[PDB]
Structures are given as structure tokens and as C-alpha cells.
Design a protein around this ligand. Structure first.
Ligand SMILES: CC(C)S(=O)(=O)N(Cc1ccc(C(=O)NO)cc1)Cc1cccnc1
Ligand SMILES: [K+]
Ligand SMILES: [K+]
Ligand SMILES: [Zn+2]
Length: 354
């Protein structure tokens, strides 16, 4: 049983020319990589090479217009970059951004390919910029292309169209792009846990509420677990996994699991306001490893405390490598309210919840 790891320092080249201390820092990925070396986890993994996604691969999820405009930013002047970035919600762009986004996606494709051809059992992808806010037609929230959604379609392209892919998104933010890309799709089950605050928390849309269950043939295949009123942490995430994520996932029986693994719900994050611990993330990973015969790919999304994300992701990798889960406040009442609302919304579609 081999664990893959992909990391390429040149994904650090994407940078914010106007605000060099912007939290989506180049050093997010180098710090996570360094922590893996420091804990002697890196030598335990098989290194999977990074590569650039192709434009044809991007078209698995994105429109030609969106691909073309982001592609053009490689040769734009500073004023062009500033004006283009300001067309989107929370985007900065440098001449290196497009290539870095291609590298993030291609890294994840090579990891999925290694899992699906049996070269490795599981894998971790230390990549930036993130992806889960990117839509078919637009960039958003530090994300240019939807790396995880692309990886799910890439996986289908090298196996069969109907390959069952579970995406668990534990970034503190709702993956609006991933939900929308697969909203009418029953072959990809999207489960997101996120700070919601009745629609007041970024990305500020009631699309993230529990009553959005999917559309068309995707009804039931979109599971939003939204948190309101409380600094959620390990007890709340474990409860959501016990009552919702794991029962639904087991019934879906995925053949591949992708984790949109932001670490912005971590204790110490400057934006998320939550308190999931590294041991908490380790337990969530270990639970997911019971699915899909262990074929799990962990993809970095957000997370902005360099120390917290490095400790948290490296512990997930420890779990992928087969290490025993480390040992873990009273459950917050508000979290149980959210869990019960999701249970009511999804009981029609999942017998394991009845
Ligand atoms: C408006 C900006 C100054 S902002 O930086 O504060 N911000 C933009 C932002 C977008 C996406 C992510 C992410 O991690 N997605 O997965 C993080 C931040 C709004 C905000 C605020 C408070 C908590 N969360 C998001
Ligand atoms: K999420
Ligand atoms: K779906
Ligand atoms: Zn986030």
C-alpha cells in the first residue's frame, strides 16, 4: 500500500502584486511540504510528478471563454492584470497565475491516474491556487479553475463516464463552483460542510443551504451541511460524519474519493473562525479511508494559518500512510440543529438515513 504525494515549488509563483501579504500566500504550499519533510512523512510517500493540465482537460468543466481569458493573463501588463482581477469576486492575478492553476490541476490528474491504475492506493496534492469556488464560466475566491471538479471528470475520462466519485469538501467555505458543476449529476456526489451563518458568510449565497439537494438527475447527490452560530470544531465535524457524511457515502459506494481539503476551519485560521484540530482532520481522513477501498485523494483548497495548515495536512497524510489515529468540548446545540435539517432534506434520497 503506497501513498502518493505531489508538490511543485513553481506553484509558488502565483502572487499578489498589490498586496504581498495577502493570505493566499506562495508559502502555504512550501510550508506544508516542509512540515512533511520535518516529520519524515515525505520519504514514506511515492513522489508523483506534477504536470500542466491541457486546455482540452480544462474544457471538461470550463467554458472556452473563461479558459481563453485566464490564459491571456500570462502576457498581460500590470494594469491589465489589476482590471481583469477586479472583474471577479476576490481574485488577484499575476503573469504566473494561469500556469500555476494548470500545474495544480495537472498534479491532481497525475495523482488520480496513479490511484486508478493501481500504482498507489491513496495520495495527497499540495497545490495552489485553490479551486472549489471556480465556476464553469468564472473565477472566484482565489480560484481560477475547479481543480477537484476537473479531477473528477478526468478520472471518468480514463475509466468510464459513470465512475462514481465522492467529493467531500471540508474547507470552511462552501464550494459553490463544485456544487454548480455537478448540480445535475448523479455520478459525482458532492458533500460540503461549511460555515454558513444564514447566508452571511462567504461566498454569501443561499445556494449553500441544506435544502439545495441537487437538480434533475442529480437530486439527492448534493449534500450541504451548513453551520450557524457557533465556533465549530472536532465534536461537530465528527457528529456530521457519523450522522450524514459516512451513511450517505457508504450508500453511494464511491469508486474514488476526492477531498476538497481546505484547512481554513482549523484552530488558528485568520478567516474561518472555527477550531478543528489536526487530530480532528486525522480522524476525518481515517473515516474516509474506509470508503472506495481506500482510493482517496486529498487536494489542498484554502487554509491561511501557515502553522495550522502544515500540521493539519501533514497529519492527514500520516493517516493515508496507515498510522493509527491520534486521540481527540460538549457538542454545540446549533450543530445538532443543522445536522437534523440535513437529515430531513436527504431522507427522501438515502435509505441509510431513514
Ligand atoms: C473580501 C476579502 C478581503 S477576504 O479575504 O476576507 N474574503 C475572500 C475569501 C475568498 C475565499 C476564501 C477561501 O478560503 N475559500 O475556500 C477566503 C477568503 C472574504 C471572507 C471573509 C471572511 C471569511 N471568509 C472569507
Ligand atoms: K466546504
Ligand atoms: K452532484
Ligand atoms: Zn476556504
Amino acid at each position: 500500500p503506497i501513498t502518493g504525494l505531489v508538490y511543485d515549488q513553481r506553484m509558488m509563483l502565483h502572487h499578489n502584486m498589490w498586496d504581498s501579504h495577502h493570505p493566499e500566500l506562495p508559502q502555504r504550499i512550501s510550508r506544508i511540504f516542509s512540515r512533511h519533510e520535518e516529520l519524515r512523512l515525505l520519504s514514506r510517500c511515492h513522489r508523483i510528478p506534477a504536470r500542466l493540465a491541457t486546455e482540452e482537460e480544462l474544457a471538461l468543466c470550463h467554458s472556452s471563454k473563461h479558459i481563453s481569458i485566464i490564459k491571456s493573463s500570462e502576457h498581460m501588463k500590470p494594469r491589465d492584470l489589476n482590471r481583469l482581477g477586479d472583474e471577479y469576486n476576490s481574485i488577484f492575478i499575476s503573469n504566473e497565475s494561469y500556469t500555476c492553476a494548470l500545474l495544480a490541476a495537472g498534479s491532481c490528474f497525475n495523482s488520480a491516474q496513479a490511484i486508478l491504475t493501481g500504482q498507489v492506493r491513496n495520495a495527497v496534492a499540495i497545490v495552489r491556487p485553490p479551486g472549489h469556488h471556480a465556476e464553469k464560466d468564472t473565477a472566484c475566491g482565489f480560484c481560477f479553475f475547479n481543480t477537484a471538479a476537473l479531477t473528477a471528470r478526468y478520472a471518468q475520462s480514463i475509466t468510464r463516464e459513470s465512475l462514481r466519485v465522492l467529493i467531500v469538501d471540508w474547507d470552511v467555505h462552501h464550494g459553490n463552483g463544485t456544487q454548480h458543476i455537478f448540480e445535475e449529476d448523479d455520478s459525482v456526489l458532492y458533500i460540503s460542510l461549511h460555515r454558513y451563518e444564514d447566508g452571511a458568510f462567504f461566498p454569501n449565497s443561499e445556494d449553500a443551504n441544506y435544502d439545495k439537494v441537487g437538480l434533475g438527475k442529480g437530486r439527492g447527490y448534493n449534500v450541504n451541511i451548513p453551520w450557524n452560530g457557533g465556533k465549530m470544531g472536532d465534536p461537530e465535524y465528527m457528529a456530521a460524519f457519523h450522522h450524514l457524511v459516512m451513511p450517505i457515502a457508504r450508500e453511494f459506494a464511491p469508486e474514488l474519493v476526492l477531498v476538497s481539503a481546505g484547512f481554513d476551519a482549523a484552530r488558528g485560521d485568520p478567516l474561518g473562525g472555527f477550531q478543528v484540530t489536526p487530530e480532528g482532520y486525522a480522524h476525518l481522513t481515517h473515516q474516509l479511508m474506509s470508503l472506495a477501498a481506500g482510493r482517496v485523494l486529498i487536494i489542498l483548497e484554502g487554509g491561511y494559518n501557515l502553522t495550522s495548515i502544515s500540521e493539519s495536512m501533514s497529519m492527514c497524510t500520516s493517516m493515508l500512510l496507515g498510522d493509527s489515529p491520534p486521540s481527540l468540548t460538549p457538542l454545540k446545540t446549533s450543530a445538532t440543529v443543522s445536522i437534523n435539517n440535513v437529515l430531513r432534506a436527504h431522507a427522501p434520497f438515502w435509505s441509510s438515513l431513514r
